[PDB]
Symmetry: C3
Subunit: 55 residues, 3 copies
Amino acid sequence: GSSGVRLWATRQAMLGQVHEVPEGWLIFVAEQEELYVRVQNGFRKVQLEARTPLP
Amino acid sequence: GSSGVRLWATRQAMLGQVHEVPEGWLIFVAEQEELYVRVQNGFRKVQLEARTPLP
Amino acid sequence: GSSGVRLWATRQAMLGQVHEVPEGWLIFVAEQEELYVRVQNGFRKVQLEARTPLP
């Protein structure tokens, strides 16, 4: 078994496309800064803390 | 450095095989809807929220 | 869109290199047992539970 992480630009695309992305595939909604993992029948959003500066 | 996500069907397989999967490798137990990441000496289960419908 | 997980040995390397690693790329600081995901402008550390024994 194996998977990956799928990048997205808006919670738009990912919502009309979470249909394909097979089980156990992280789902990144970049503009929303949201990471969910594709589960059995729908998705389960993983908990992250507030952002840490980059510079 | 680089890794990936490893898919599984039951908390069975993943338990007798978490031995190989090297550090920093997410571990997905599909049937359990559990995502853990392989750490230094054992695994650290990542926190997810309750499932969001797919349809 | 697509990404991956990037492995590191110390919160050193990852701090001077979180600059490259593009959006939506998990970041693993192995020695710290920390998993963050690279977001819009800096990183957002994902929440994990305490470690589970491996043996």
